[PDB]
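User: Can you write out an input/output pair for a complex, sequences first and structure second?

Assistant: Here is one pair. Inputs:
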Amino acid sequence: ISRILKRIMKSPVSRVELAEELGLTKTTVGEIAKIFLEKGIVVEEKDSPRPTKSLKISPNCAYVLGIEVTRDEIAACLIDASMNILAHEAHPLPSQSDREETLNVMYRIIDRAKDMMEKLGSKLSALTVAAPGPIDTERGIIIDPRNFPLSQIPLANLLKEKYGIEVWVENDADMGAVGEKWYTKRDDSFAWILTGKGIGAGIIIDGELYRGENGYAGEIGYTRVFNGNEYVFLEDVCNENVVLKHVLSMGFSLAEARDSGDVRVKEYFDDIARYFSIGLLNLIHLFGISKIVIGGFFKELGENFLKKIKIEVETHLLYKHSVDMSFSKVQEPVIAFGAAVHALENYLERVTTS
Amino acid sequence: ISRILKRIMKSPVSRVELAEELGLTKTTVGEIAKIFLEKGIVVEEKDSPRPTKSLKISPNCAYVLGIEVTRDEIAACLIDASMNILAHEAHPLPSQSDREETLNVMYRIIDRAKDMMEKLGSKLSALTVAAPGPIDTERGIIIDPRNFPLSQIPLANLLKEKYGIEVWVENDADMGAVGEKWYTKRDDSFAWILTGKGIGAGIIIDGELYRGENGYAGEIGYTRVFNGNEYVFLEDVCNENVVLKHVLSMGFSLAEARDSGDVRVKEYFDDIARYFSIGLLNLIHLFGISKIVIGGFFKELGENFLKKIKIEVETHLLYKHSVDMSFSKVQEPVIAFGAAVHALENYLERVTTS
Ligand SMILES: [K+]
Ligand SMILES: [K+]
């Protein structure tokens, strides 16, 4: 294999650094550098301080689009090969959208990105669609049994056909995690937790995305939770809808609740933090991780809510050791962005292999 | 690095096969083979059917001991470098054993193995102790907070000092999993579940043992389970003690229960299978695995009990896909054995690096 490409993407790096840090011959890398450097994928430049030259990905060699699909909205993120965001957007969907209605918005978005590059004399080279639930990553199909207008449909294929580019389909929480990895320049281990409409985790280990054998991983949304009457999934309780709909009962705006200073709100948020923790504790106790990053809906609850989760987790932890809870602070769209970067690796990995 | 050593252990393999299957130069492997073959670690032999030669680990180059520690007993497994079992044994401990009482039995066992090799003109080269709970694998300390007479003690160090060999300390469920990997010649992914006295999982992914950042992984024993009155750990409910002690109430021998054909037994075993599944489902939904192997106490409940677990898991599975449940069928001591093989890799990996 190669994937010095993986490292050149990580950051500018010289031939000596690659050969040493990865392990290989000066003549092996020197030749591959010749290919990359010829294909217009990479460039060599003197470093800002005898002297030395590094390898950098050339922004011009690839433009790719990432997309996130939710029940209420579709977001897109267009990047160059340096993963600079050229444009990002979001098109809401109508109440209860069809297969056909949802696809139309998606086609619209892709046509917009295809056209925008073509007017700038270049092209859209590939695309990665991010969606909820389990996914057939090899065939490019959304397996999610739950009512989604894009389930059991050869999505990658119909897009490939229609557009003549490379298309992948990928779990949304996984792509959120990929988004944090790159936007934060991390290479450690953590879990990126998706919240709002759906619950799930993207699991990153030593900088790589963790993958399951059956199209899913980190699925903490199916954590069995007993509410006092019957059992429910953790996803049914943390759902952004169920939360605000319940606050319609409370009387309280979506935010005002906390500003209300009502014990009833405190105890309701405590209920959710407790449940949520059960799922986090599973991840921690099973994967043996320490770092967790929360994204989406739960950000809106603030550090007052994060303090409770921290506490619930400290309390029920297997033994006393440090655990880092945090919110994501990536400017939106974090999932569409991760999906875009996913498309970039996979497109560059494919182009070099030929 | 090397760890063609890892592959030569896997099975007999030629220089061409290594160079190709792993990726390297004919002259790189040819030189390393020279080292290994000189150190008496490896041998070259014509294959049983122009002709070709393979590399095999030489059984004579290393003899190592594996040990499992339980509250009631200590078991040992002595092997050669081909991982043939030379001897295995088990010494029960008295009711509620001291640090000193437990260590005495352990010293006795190690002295027995040290002496047995020395009378055969060789020596005991290393040792791996397997124990329950979280473990400081780098310093060789059993961190388990739960009352264990060997907790918070520099175990590896005091053994290293006393014996002058290499000593490691390792999680018992992890070593059970390692035991299955090698005894079954598997290189796929699965979870080995320890049952009886304690509950836990050893997680293997693509043939390697999965490790956490904090001295543990696969800890499903701390799965929160609501019994109807209050919450308890899954470990408190599946505990071999709690089960048989409860059967003292039932009236029923430890086995007769099932042969009794009593609905009360059926429904009690159903209760446990249900709980147990909650923990298995976490593993499956989080790690995205499909294969599970159960060992220990639960074997004694038979396929009638495995059929129920299978069912509970099928039912609550994220989506309809195949899941393989099975019991371990390794002749005891499976954990002591895995620990022995762990010691062998680590001893051979250390000896070659010098
Ligand atoms: K996931
Ligand atoms: K474990």
